[PDB]
Amino acid sequence: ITAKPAKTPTSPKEQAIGLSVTFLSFLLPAGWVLYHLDNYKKS
Amino acid sequence: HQTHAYHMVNPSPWPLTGALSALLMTSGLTMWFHFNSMTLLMIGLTTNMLTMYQWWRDVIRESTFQGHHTPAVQKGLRYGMILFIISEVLFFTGFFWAFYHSSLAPTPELGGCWPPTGIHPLNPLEVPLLNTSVLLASGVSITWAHHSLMEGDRKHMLQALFITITLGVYFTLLQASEYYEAPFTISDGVYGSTFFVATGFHGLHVIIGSTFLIVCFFRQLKFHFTSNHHFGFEAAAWYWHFVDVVWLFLYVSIYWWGS
Amino acid sequence: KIKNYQTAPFDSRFPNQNQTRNCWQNYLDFHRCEKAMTAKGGDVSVCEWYRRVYKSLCPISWVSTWDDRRAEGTFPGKI
Amino acid sequence: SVVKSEDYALPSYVDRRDYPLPDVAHVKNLSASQKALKEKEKASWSSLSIDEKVELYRLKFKESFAEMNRSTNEWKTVVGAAMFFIGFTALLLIWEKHYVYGPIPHTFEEEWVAKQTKRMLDMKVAPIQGFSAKWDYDKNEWKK
Amino acid sequence: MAYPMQLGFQDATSPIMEELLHFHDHTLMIVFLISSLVLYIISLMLTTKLTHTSTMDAQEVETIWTILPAIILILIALPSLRILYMMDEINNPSLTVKTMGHQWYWSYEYTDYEDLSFDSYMIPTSELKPGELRLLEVDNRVVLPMEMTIRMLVSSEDVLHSWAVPSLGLKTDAIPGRLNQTTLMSSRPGLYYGQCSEICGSNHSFMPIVLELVPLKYFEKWSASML
Amino acid sequence: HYEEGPGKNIPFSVENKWRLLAMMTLFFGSGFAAPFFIVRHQLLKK
Amino acid sequence: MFINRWLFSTNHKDIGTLYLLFGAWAGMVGTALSLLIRAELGQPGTLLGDDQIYNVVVTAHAFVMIFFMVMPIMIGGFGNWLVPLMIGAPDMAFPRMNNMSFWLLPPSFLLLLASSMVEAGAGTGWTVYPPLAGNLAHAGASVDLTIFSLHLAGVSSILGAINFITTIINMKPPAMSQYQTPLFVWSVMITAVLLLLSLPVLAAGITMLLTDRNLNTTFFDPAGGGDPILYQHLFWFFGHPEVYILILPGFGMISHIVTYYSGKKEPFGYMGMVWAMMSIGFLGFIVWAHHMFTVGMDVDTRAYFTSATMIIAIPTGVKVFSWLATLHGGNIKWSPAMMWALGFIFLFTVGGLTGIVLANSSLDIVLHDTYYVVAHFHYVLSMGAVFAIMGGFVHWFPLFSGYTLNDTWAKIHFAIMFVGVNMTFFPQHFLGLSGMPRRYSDYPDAYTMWNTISSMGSFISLTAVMLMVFIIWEAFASKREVLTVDLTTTNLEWLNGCPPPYHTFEEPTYVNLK
Amino acid sequence: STALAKPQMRGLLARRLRFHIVGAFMVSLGFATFYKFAVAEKRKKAYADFYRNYDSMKDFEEMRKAGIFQSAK
Amino acid sequence: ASGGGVPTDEEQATGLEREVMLAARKGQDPYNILAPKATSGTKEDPNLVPSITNKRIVGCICEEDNSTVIWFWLHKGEAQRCPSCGTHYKLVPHQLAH
Amino acid sequence: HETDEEFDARWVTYFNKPDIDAWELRKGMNTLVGYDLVPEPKIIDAALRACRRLNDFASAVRILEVVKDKAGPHKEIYPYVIQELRPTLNELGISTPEELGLDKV
Amino acid sequence: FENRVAEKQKLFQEDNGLPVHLKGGATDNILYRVTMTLCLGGTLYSLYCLGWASFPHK
Amino acid sequence: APDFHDKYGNAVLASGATFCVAVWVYMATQIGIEWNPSPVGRVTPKEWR
Amino acid sequence: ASAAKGDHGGTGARTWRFLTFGLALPSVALCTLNSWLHSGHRERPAFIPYHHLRIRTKPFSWGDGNHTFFHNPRVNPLPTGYEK
Numbered sequence A: 001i002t003a004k005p006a007k008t009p010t011s012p013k014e015q016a017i018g019l020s021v022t023f024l025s026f027l028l029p030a031g032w033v034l035y036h037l038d039n040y041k042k043s
Numbered sequence B: 001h002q003t004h005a006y007h008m009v010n011p012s013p014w015p016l017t018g019a020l021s022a023l024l025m026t027s028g029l030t031m032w033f034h035f036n037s038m039t040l041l042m043i044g045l046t047t048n049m050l051t052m053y054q055w056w057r058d059v060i061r062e063s064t065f066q067g068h069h070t071p072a073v074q075k076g077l078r079y080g081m082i083l084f085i086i087s088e089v090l091f092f093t094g095f096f097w098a099f100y101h102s103s104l105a106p107t108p109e110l111g112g113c114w115p116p117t118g119i120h121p122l123n124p125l126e127v128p129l130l131n132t133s134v135l136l137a138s139g140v141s142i143t144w145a146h147h148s149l150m151e152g153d154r155k156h157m158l159q160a161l162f163i164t165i166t167l168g169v170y171f172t173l174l175q176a177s178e179y180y181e182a183p184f185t186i187s188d189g190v191y192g193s194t195f196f197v198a199t200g201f202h203g204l205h206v207i208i209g210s211t212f213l214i215v216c217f218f219r220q221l222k223f224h225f226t227s228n229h230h231f232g233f234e235a236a237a238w239y240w241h242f243v244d245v246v247w248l249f250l251y252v253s254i255y256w257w258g259s
Numbered sequence C: 001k002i003k004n005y006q007t008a009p010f011d012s013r014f015p016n017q018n019q020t021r022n023c024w025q026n027y028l029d030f031h032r033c034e035k036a037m038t039a040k041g042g043d044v045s046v047c048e049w050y051r052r053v054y055k056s057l058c059p060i061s062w063v064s065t066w067d068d069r070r071a072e073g074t075f076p077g078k079i
Numbered sequence D: 001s002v003v004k005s006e007d008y009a010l011p012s013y014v015d016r017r018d019y020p021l022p023d024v025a026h027v028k029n030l031s032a033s034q035k036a037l038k039e040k041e042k043a044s045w046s047s048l049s050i051d052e053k054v055e056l057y058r059l060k061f062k063e064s065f066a067e068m069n070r071s072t073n074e075w076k077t078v079v080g081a082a083m084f085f086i087g088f089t090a091l092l093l094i095w096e097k098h099y100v101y102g103p104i105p106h107t108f109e110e111e112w113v114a115k116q117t118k119r120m121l122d123m124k125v126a127p128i129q130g131f132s133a134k135w136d137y138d139k140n141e142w143k144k
Numbered sequence E: 001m002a003y004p005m006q007l008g009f010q011d012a013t014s015p016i017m018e019e020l021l022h023f024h025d026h027t028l029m030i031v032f033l034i035s036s037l038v039l040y041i042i043s044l045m046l047t048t049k050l051t052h053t054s055t056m057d058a059q060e061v062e063t064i065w066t067i068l069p070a071i072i073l074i075l076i077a078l079p080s081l082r083i084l085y086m087m088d089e090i091n092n093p094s095l096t097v098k099t100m101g102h103q104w105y106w107s108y109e110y111t112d113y114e115d116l117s118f119d120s121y122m123i124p125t126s127e128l129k130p131g132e133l134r135l136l137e138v139d140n141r142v143v144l145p146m147e148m149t150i151r152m153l154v155s156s157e158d159v160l161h162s163w164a165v166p167s168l169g170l171k172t173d174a175i176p177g178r179l180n181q182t183t184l185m186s187s188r189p190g191l192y193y194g195q196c197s198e199i200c201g202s203n204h205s206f207m208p209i210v211l212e213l214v215p216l217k218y219f220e221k222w223s224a225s226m227l
Numbered sequence F: 001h002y003e004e005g006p007g008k009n010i011p012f013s014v015e016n017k018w019r020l021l022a023m024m025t026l027f028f029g030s031g032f033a034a035p036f037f038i039v040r041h042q043l044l045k046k
Numbered sequence G: 001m002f003i004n005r006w007l008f009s010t011n012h013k014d015i016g017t018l019y020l021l022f023g024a025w026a027g028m029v030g031t032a033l034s035l036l037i038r039a040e041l042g043q044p045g046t047l048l049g050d051d052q053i054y055n056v057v058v059t060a061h062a063f064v065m066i067f068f069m070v071m072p073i074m075i076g077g078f079g080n081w082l083v084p085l086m087i088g089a090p091d092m093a094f095p096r097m098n099n100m101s102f103w104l105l106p107p108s109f110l111l112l113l114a115s116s117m118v119e120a121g122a123g124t125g126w127t128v129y130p131p132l133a134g135n136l137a138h139a140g141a142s143v144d145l146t147i148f149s150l151h152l153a154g155v156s157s158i159l160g161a162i163n164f165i166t167t168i169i170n171m172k173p174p175a176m177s178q179y180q181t182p183l184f185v186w187s188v189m190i191t192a193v194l195l196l197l198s199l200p201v202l203a204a205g206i207t208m209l210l211t212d213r214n215l216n217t218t219f220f221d222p223a224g225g226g227d228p229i230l231y232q233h234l235f236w237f238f239g240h241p242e243v244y245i246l247i248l249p250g251f252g253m254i255s256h257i258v259t260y261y262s263g264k265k266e267p268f269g270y271m272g273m274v275w276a277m278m279s280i281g282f283l284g285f286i287v288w289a290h291h292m293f294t295v296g297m298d299v300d301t302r303a304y305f306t307s308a309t310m311i312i313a314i315p316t317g318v319k320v321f322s323w324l325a326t327l328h329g330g331n332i333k334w335s336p337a338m339m340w341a342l343g344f345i346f347l348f349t350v351g352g353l354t355g356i357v358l359a360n361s362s363l364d365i366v367l368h369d370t371y372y373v374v375a376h377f378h379y380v381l382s383m384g385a386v387f388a389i390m391g392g393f394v395h396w397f398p399l400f401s402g403y404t405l406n407d408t409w410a411k412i413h414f415a416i417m418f419v420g421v422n423m424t425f426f427p428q429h430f431l432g433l434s435g436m437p438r439r440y441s442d443y444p445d446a447y448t449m450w451n452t453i454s455s456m457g458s459f460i461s462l463t464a465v466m467l468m469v470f471i472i473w474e475a476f477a478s479k480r481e482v483l484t485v486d487l488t489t490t491n492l493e494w495l496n497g498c499p500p501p502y503h504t505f506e507e508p509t510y511v512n513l514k
Numbered sequence H: 001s002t003a004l005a006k007p008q009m010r011g012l013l014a015r016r017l018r019f020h021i022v023g024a025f026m027v028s029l030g031f032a033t034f035y036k037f038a039v040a041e042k043r044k045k046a047y048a049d050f051y052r053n054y055d056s057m058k059d060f061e062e063m064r065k066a067g068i069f070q071s072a073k
Numbered sequence I: 001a002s003g004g005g006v007p008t009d010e011e012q013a014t015g016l017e018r019e020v021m022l023a024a025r026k027g028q029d030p031y032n033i034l035a036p037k038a039t040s041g042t043k044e045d046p047n048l049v050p051s052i053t054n055k056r057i058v059g060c061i062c063e064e065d066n067s068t069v070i071w072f073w074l075h076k077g078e079a080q081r082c083p084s085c086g087t088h089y090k091l092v093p094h095q096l097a098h
Numbered sequence J: 001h002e003t004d005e006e007f008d009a010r011w012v013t014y015f016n017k018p019d020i021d022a023w024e025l026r027k028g029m030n031t032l033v034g035y036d037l038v039p040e041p042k043i044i045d046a047a048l049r050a051c052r053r054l055n056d057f058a059s060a061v062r063i064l065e066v067v068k069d070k071a072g073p074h075k076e077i078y079p080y081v082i083q084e085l086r087p088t089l090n091e092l093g094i095s096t097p098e099e100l101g102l103d104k105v
Numbered sequence K: 001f002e003n004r005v006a007e008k009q010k011l012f013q014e015d016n017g018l019p020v021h022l023k024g025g026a027t028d029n030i031l032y033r034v035t036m037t038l039c040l041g042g043t044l045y046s047l048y049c050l051g052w053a054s055f056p057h058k
Numbered sequence L: 001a002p003d004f005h006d007k008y009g010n011a012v013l014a015s016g017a018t019f020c021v022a023v024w025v026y027m028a029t030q031i032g033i034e035w036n037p038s039p040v041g042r043v044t045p046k047e048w049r
Numbered sequence M: 001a002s003a004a005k006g007d008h009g010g011t012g013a014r015t016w017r018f019l020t021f022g023l024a025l026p027s028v029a030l031c032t033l034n035s036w037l038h039s040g041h042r043e044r045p046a047f048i049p050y051h052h053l054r055i056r057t058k059p060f061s062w063g064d065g066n067h068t069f070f071h072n073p074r075v076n077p078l079p080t081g082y083e084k
Ligand SMILES: CCCCCCCCCCCCCCCCCC(=O)OCC(COC(=O)CCCCCCCCCCCCCCCCC)OC(=O)CCCCCCCCCCCCCCCCC
Pocket: E007, E008, E009, E028, E031, E032, E035, E036, E039, G350, G354, G422, G423, G426, G427, G429, G430, G433, G453
């Protein structure tokens, strides 16, 4: 396939931000639940 | 401007109101079964009837009034109706499987016999036989209705279609009376389970088919059908014959062989 | 005593994995025989083989339930 | 030169080793000099200079076969990055072990395992090949 | 029982389980070969710059790769079905034992002669005696005479369970209202372990099976003592 | 009629990549978090 | 305008887009449930301390991945986008009924989530066997909510099947016969026939379970003369066709991806591929009781189900060898979609072969209800259906969106996923051979090592899932618009541009009969 | 400057295919032979060697003396 | 026995259904219900492809019973050739209906 | 099911058609490289002369490149084919890709 | 009865840009709003019922 | 003109591999994971009764 | 089979009306006669509290929870026997 160059280029810095935000959106809420599992058990 | 013959449908809210009505009916049944309340269920049944009404109303608008049903579109609806009927056949096939599984291998709890100890089946030569002649006759009279319509005869189409509906209604009344008089119930083990769930779903399909025929009756009164274009009538006739054939299998299997 | 009973022998009427009917048949047979022998005065000892087989095969809880229902008048098999 | 989206339904240029002669020339519009080069091309090619032959080729085609088939270093990036993210995954597992998992059951303590191992040997667990088979009951040791 | 880092089946305790080990060896060889051949052919198709993109005729080669797999299936099915029928063949048991599944424990009934029955529960982890196996030991083992053909009858008094002992090749579902038969013959004394094998609710993981296989005269005295 | 073309045939806006990052984060993150919070809910009941 | 377009749609592309978004969201739910599974098992002992909740998580994981992830993406998503384009049709036959098939799924999913939130959830297994699923061992609303969830998803797919069959039979160019349609179109039609015939039988069986739970029927209750084993026959009479439903559109996409990146104008042996899918579809209705080899079945029945099941390897092998033959001689493009497809061919073959092991009812006695089954079907599902989905998503993303992905990031994603799924599931064969049951929250100590490795592998696949979200974001963030696509002469769906206009084929294609 | 000989120019792909399929077959038979040695027959011989002089009463008495049984002390 | 009162299509068909019906009676196919029959497809006798615009997609089944169809845009202007079999097609734009 | 010599001769005849047009030149070359062979020098000769009748120097060079490509790892084929074509290359003034620097990455 | 189909054809073919489900006139809009109000309101109510049923009640 | 891979490829491979190996070795050996390997050749059996 | 009559030279409305009034409805009228003849209530049998009948695993969602949907006091006993 061929394509135009990016209309709104995403620099390495911007990719690191998008990748970081993405991973955190998965890891933090589940990490919060799992870390407090002991507090849920025993209720 | 298109230069194929197929129908691009206007954006419609009825898919969404039908989907929501399904949520409200299933939610509603849950609420009825477990939380002593019929409120959700009544709303879902209401939105379901409203959805069906406006959706099929719009199909009538699109075809009779706007002319979108070219031969290609009509051919597609024929396939769609045939496929739908096939899926309904397989649905009944699951209940016939349940019936034969239980009755061909009656467990000790039943007395090791079919009909179970303590079950007294209806006489298949009384009301069940009458029911059979009623649906068989309605299959004759709806074929008369179809030929009258194709031959351009409005009055005899209406007479034959009215006879067909009347017989459908007679069957439903006879079946409701048989249900009330039956000395066994749905809670009478697997005999009552298979009897009432299989004939009960069949009864629901008789009601649906009679409703469909009644829709065709009023479309005919309003001159919607031409002598060559009347797919709603054909579909209701195919569905009606399906309901007839399922009855014949129920009659032979559950009422006669299973008695 | 045409026995020396170890356990219930293979029964060609019930050769497959589901043995429910073997248990049920020998239970029915024992109680049918005991009813006929108890009527005409005879000795239930002629019923012994059916008794041994169904006791070997049948779950305790089934026998117990079937015994209760026969006493209650609700046993659905024919004896 | 410049390919446009609204040209999608037209024949297009591509460099593919298995479609050597694409549907259009790489360069459609010709300058004054390029026009005269194409006129020169109608005479004997022996009178074209090397530079003129290369200019002709580059009007017709974008990349040569050697250019279009060149290998790249991309595998280093792919393999190295995948290892980085697999490495990151072990960080998550260290976190899970430290903050989520409690102690495992007391049956994994060394003395428990030694006693359970003897009992398995005493009951001859898997004595044909799997386990006790590997113990020497005469020398009272694992078979060497 | 299984041992740490085990790769294959538990060592066979019954001759039928031995048959299954050899049949699995046969079948696994075929599995390895076919999967290896596919992986290899993939790598072969992908490692040349030579090309051939015109239309290829298929009829010749589709014979090969219909008939060869059909032959291979038959070479699997024949030993498979032999084992299946051999398992089914008439045995003449010396003893019948019933087991009833419950939530969550097994009961056992030995009623050929006396009315012997008892419940068999997992030993909780905190009560294991030193060297006993977490989640596998029970309080009351299924003592059985070794080197003898036993009929096991399996049912349930509540939901489905399934009565399994891998090293004897046994797994028979436990269905209320139904009495499923299987036969058991241990070549060896010892303790043989299995675990409930149909999800039966929250303690499915924790209703194990332990058979204790001993000489007949030991079994007789044990039986007498359990009345 | 309706807008056509890249970025226009979708029910979400891609006009700003950071607002899009937020939306995608809420969207995929809500699906991924839900089972953890359902388990939490069931543990807290008893 | 927004509501008209996206809630009231009658357009096959926009509806396909809705299905892809829904399935992508479902994928997150199903993945998180799978991670909870593997966290419970990642070390000996208990993590949740509540095995009813463990059972609920296992059950939901399966329903989510099957009904809300795979079927909507493959059939609703790729089928709606691609089938009308591939036959030059202007939309589906029933474009408004099509929209109701979509909008029944959010309510279906809501009902499933409701079941897990009320009472103690439905901790039944995705088979929902009675009596465990009955009103004594699972009293209260959870199982009934699960049944109703299945009813709605069932209606959705039955109406979708009618739509696809009608479209594919009735809306081709008048010169195109069925033997001139692309293999993906054939794969959708066959899947739709299987859906049409099997889902009504499931519906019948789960309705009987509903009436046993709520109307005092006793179809499955011995006390009334019923039989739990009857439920199993009805369930698996659907459930085996269901696994062929989950893979057949996958086979269709694989055939297009392998043909395309081999630089071929056509798959090897086209009529053989059609024959193979039809044969698979047909045999897929007469093998269901290999799910019941331990229930106490007569020996001749076992011998028949063993033999009929094995015969499916023959048409399946014709497809595998035909894909290899499509690669043969190709100008191989090593795109990320091609990598997904090559991994598909190998890992699906591994999983299909352990299926043939299980078909032998004598061995299945010892393998049934063990992790050997789990290993088997995650090779055909998590490395078969999922790899076909990723391949098709990478390949056709520029068509659907107008934008390209970063190929390097997409290759990295494939690499991580390939390591993760194999580390997760390959050791489960050992656990199964050595006797570990499935549906367990904890295991005897000997099984610790393989369970530990398997749970670590599931975190690697999580990292790949997270990266996939970033990759999609980066594509939409950067906006590289497509210019040229190769091989459009044999890939009609690309020929209206990227993305195609809302209405395509308003003027139909011209095809001569000659 | 001698001329170059004419090489094979036709069917090069098909020739590579044939050569390596044949090679694959030969490796397959080599593996099947090795596996029958190292796995299948090895197992048959272990089971046969084990049971040839196996004394089940002596095995039992050892287990009984190790204290493993509930029913036998 | 006998009587009337049922409308005919000639009386009551409307919209697109009526257009197709009336065109078929004239032997015309403006909504592409029929498959066109091929010419010899030479440069001198090209297949004639009607269109309501300046380009139309052609599918070419190069030989009888090929399963592979060859697809391309046919543009207003000089005849184009199928890239697989070379047979010729020429666009004939027209009118307002088809 | 025709002989090698019959195949080659069909292709020679194809490219030798005096009024062969540009479309036919491309169609021929693009079809020919789909087969499992490197085309005989006599075929390339006819295609190169067709390039000459079509005043297309660049496609003559591209044809030499695809000959080299179709040989894959068989490094002896291309030097033989160029050898056999030397009189035609000289006659028509066709420079090889190597002489033009077009073999450099 | 008399055949009034031609009148309905004229009404539903009038070039007023309305979708078919509203093209009958103001009664369509009313019935539409009734349907969608019951659906959305019933759906919110079902969410409330989920909320209630999600917790134990003694 | 060198692309991303020409300029950074070598470093991405080397540092990625180094990081991957080090962190998995650490996770595997240093944080108390019980792998429960075979006792064969490793455990001295001890009296239990 | 060919039934026992005869026509196909013309299929049509007249023939199917002929079948409707000459065969189908007379059949219904006969079966109506036969049924509304063997009607009249039969004896209800002695009540026996069989455990495979009058199943109650969950109360019905209507009434007092113990009556089936089309409960007929005359012929449908409750788990405890006929009503008064
Ligand atoms: C196949 C999918 C890819 C899998 C990739 C991830 C895993 C890498 C596999 C990289 C190698 C893959 C080849 C299979 C490894 C089998 C190991 C074994 O000894 O298995 C033995 C048997 C049981 O046999 C026995 O009862 C006797 C055991 C004798 C043991 C003696 C001492 C052994 C020393 C310790 C060895 C530890 C091994 C640890 C193993 C640790 C694994 C994580 O287990 C079984 O049946 C397992 C059932 C598997 C069924 C699917 C088979 C398909 C494989 C495809 C291969 C294609 C070519 C390679 C393909 C090359 C790779 C592309």
